[PDB]
Amino acid sequence: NATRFASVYAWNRKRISNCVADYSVLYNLAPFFTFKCYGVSPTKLNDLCFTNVYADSFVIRGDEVRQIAPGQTGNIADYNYKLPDDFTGCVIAWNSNKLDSKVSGNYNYLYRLFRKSNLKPFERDISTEIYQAGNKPCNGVAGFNCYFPLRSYSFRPTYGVGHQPYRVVVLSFELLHAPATVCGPKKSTNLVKNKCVNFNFNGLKGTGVLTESNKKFLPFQQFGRDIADTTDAVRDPQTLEI
């Protein structure tokens, strides 16, 4: 929900690490235009989580959302950015006709359509290289069969479905050998007392009766044990009470 963004070859690295993800206001409300992705379903992201999450901010056409796919070739998918075969993220697009556009042409952020070679996945290429396709060199200018790359946007909110400003935020997920740091929301239930019920806590699982405790405790603890090494205490994960 930013007010600015970046180019598709000048991708910033929003390093989401050591966070708590809240998808009850973003995924469940869904104020975006389309909500469709592959690999991992968005309903599995609340019950499964990953090591490092990386994000970006880039606005493209509505015709280039078919190019954002794992294993895709074509116009954008080999020359501006590339999605790998192990892509476990999701791609969300939203029409930004009232925010990201500009009257009298949008001449500020640039994008490409071709390249010298096939780039690597998540490659930040900001080069202004000189091309030479034939047998005579170009000395820095374009020519017959000599071309150059670097031109900006054409956004305006008065037209149809093809090249409206669509803000695409690719939330790339990555599971490594390191333990997880950023995970999604998980619903809670009510708490009943003075009854033989089961326990499903944040770090406890068992069956017992919840009564009022009269002992002292440390707030950085999860549970406590008695003199016979049995679990006789539980801290609430929401409130500071045992």
């Binding site: 396709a133 374009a142 150059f148 900006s152």
Partner: protein, 597 residues
């Protein structure tokens, strides 16, 4: 560094402001057609000159080393639409004079003022005025004024203005390694790089001649049917042996024969098929007429449209304070978007153009992720040939029953479809030899084999042996009959209307062979068939990445331009015009003249 690895990187800093400098002249021309103010015309000029200089700034810096090192087929087919230098190969006094002669040629065509020389005290406006007085005036002296005087006050100074315009037009194309400007319209038809499917520009001269030989039995029976029905209207003006006069064809020149339908009715006891009387009872508005017409696009198998089409484009004229020009043009404004500006009324001709102008949207929708040089037609006439397949399928009485339009018990005999097919004969077949004799006139005055005195004498000698009309007065070498139209004065291509009627018929003859329709092809409707879109989806997405020779292989399978879909579409029209022409004269002759008294 390797020669084989380097394919194509032109589309970075060319193909992103080829739209964007045209974008700033796109809405500025669109606001010129909706909000005609004093400052909404100035933004067309300074932004359109930036895009006009963009095609000449990169052309001067593309003059280094030649073409023959390329290997890929995708490189060469987009290279032909950029290496045309245009006007930038002439001098400073010759190239900029072409820009000034094109602005004075479109001004007097739109703002012309010509009226009666007998009583010039009341002098009227041309374009809403003279377009509608041709239909209702049943007089010989009244129709003589609207054809002769219009080329006598507007077209009198174009004859010393078109002679040096042709001479400068030869210099800009002979330096572009072509033989003439005559193959500049045939430069889009040039196919090279594929073995077995090579279509040169010299092959197109015999191909229009090959498809014109078999239309001469079909056109001369329509030439003898309008003439035989004008005996009770004009008893002593039109000869039964000779040709028809050219000042009574219904329009300003005689391209369309649409106003000659009400006078040549075959049977007056049965009513015509009409949506206009049944529209005002159910109270339709502007939201209905595009939504059920877009239901025709879903039922073949093309996907839906989002909210950007309904809140941006309007269908109602924005008040009576501000003037809005509403000519039917589907706005192809760059890399796959369409805003529709149409002054819609309760009119059957407005209803068929709702399917026509949305048929140019569905061609550019499929290659919306393709480059802009491939975002075009397969030729110039390929864009409007795939647009009117939705209008001829919506004029079918089997389609009107499934929606809820006309009466559910309507009689359909053999004498019902003949009045519909002769309405299509003056829309499709009636403009077909008229497209031939003007494009052959364009291909005979550009090469320069003829002198200046045979410039206009060759024009009226072709019309008495190709289309079968004769002028009532003779013209000298100071007037111009073909140069008073919309396409020739604003420098547009006229080859695109001969291939409009040919590529449309090739697609509709095979579309319900997939949908399994038994009967004639004027009862063919392409709706309620999900497998009918899959034959089109490999054709709607090929644009100019594949040429027009390989584009016809997946529907009809003919690599050449043939006339055989045009014959069995009109199979009651070939049989029922034969028995009524037993005693009249078949064809025309070159001896009758109205001024040879």
């Amino acid at each position: 560094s390797t020669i084989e690895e380097q394919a194509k990187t032109f589309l970075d800093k060319f193909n992103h402001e080829a739209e964007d400098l045209f974008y700033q002249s796109s809405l500025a021309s669109w606001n010129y057609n909706t909000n005609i103010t004093e400052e909404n015309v100035q933004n067309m000029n300074n932004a359109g000159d930036k895009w006009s200089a963009f095609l000449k700034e990169q052309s001067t810096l593309a003059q280094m080393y030649p073409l023959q090192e390329i290997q890929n087929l995708t490189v060469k087919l987009q290279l032909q639409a950029l290496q045309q230098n245009g006007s930038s190969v002439l001098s400073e006094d010759k190239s900029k004079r072409l820009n000034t002669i094109l602005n004075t040629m479109s001004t007097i065509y739109s703002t012309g003022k010509v009226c009666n020389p007998d009583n010039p005290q009341e002098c009227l406006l041309l374009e809403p005025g003279l377009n509608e007085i041709m239909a209702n005036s049943l007089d010989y002296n009244e129709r003589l004024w609207a054809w002769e005087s219009w080329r006598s006050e507007v077209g009198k100074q174009l004859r010393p203005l078109y002679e040096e315009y042709v001479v400068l037009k030869n210099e800009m194309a002979r330096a572009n390694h072509y033989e003439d400007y005559g193959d500049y319209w045939r430069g889009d038809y040039e196919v090279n790089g594929v073995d077995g499917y090579d279509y040169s520009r010299g092959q197109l001269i015999e191909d229009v001649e090959h498809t014109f030989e078999e239309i001469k039995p079909l056109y001369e029976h329509l030439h003898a049917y309008v003439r035989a029905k004008l005996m009770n209207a004009y008893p002593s003006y039109i000869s039964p042996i000779g040709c028809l006069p050219a000042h009574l064809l219904g329009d300003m020149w005689g391209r369309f024969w649409t106003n000659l339908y009400s006078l040549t009715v075959p049977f007056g006891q049965k009513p015509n098929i009409d949506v206009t009387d049944a529209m005002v009872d159910q109270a339709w508005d502007a939201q209905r007429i595009f939504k059920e017409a877009e239901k025709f696009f879903v039922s073949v198998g093309l996907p839906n449209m989002t909210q950007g089409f309904w809140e941006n484009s309007m269908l109602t004229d924005p008040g009576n304070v501000q003037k809005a020009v509403c000519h039917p043009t589907a706005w192809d404004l760059g890399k796959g978007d369409f805003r529709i500006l149409m002054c819609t009324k309760v009119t059957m001709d407005d209803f068929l153009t709702a399917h026509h102008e949305m048929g140019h949207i569905q061609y550019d929708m499929a290659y919306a992720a393709q480059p802009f040089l491939l975002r075009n037609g397969a030729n110039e006439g390929f864009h409007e040939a795939v647009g009117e397949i939705m209008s001829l399928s919506a004029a079918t009485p089997k389609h009107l029953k499934s929606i809820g339009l006309l009466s559910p018990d309507f009689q359909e005999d053999n004498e019902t479809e003949i009045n519909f097919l002769l309405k299509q004969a003056l829309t499709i077949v009636g403009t077909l030899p008229f497209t031939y004799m003007l494009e052959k006139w364009r291909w005979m005055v550009f090469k320069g084999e003829i002198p200046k005195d045979q410039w206009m004498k060759k024009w009226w000698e072709m019309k008495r042996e190709i289309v079968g009309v004769v002028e009532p007065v003779p013209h000298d070498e100071t007037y111009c009959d073909p140069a008073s139209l919309f396409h020739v004065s604003n420098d547009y291509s006229f080859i695109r209307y001969y291939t409009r009627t040919l590529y449309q018929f090739q697609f509709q003859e095979a579309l319900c062979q997939a949908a399994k329709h038994e009967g004639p092809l004027h009862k063919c409707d392409i709706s309620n068939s999900t497998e009918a879109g899959q034959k089109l989806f490999n054709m709607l997405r090929l644009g100019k990445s594949e040429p027009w020779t390989l584009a016809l292989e997946n529907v009809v399978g003919a690599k050449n331009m043939n006339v055989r879909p045009l014959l069995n579409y009109f199979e009651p029209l070939f049989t029922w015009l034969k028995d009524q022409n037993k005693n009249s004269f078949v064809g025309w002759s070159t001896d009758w003249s109205p001024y040879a008294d």
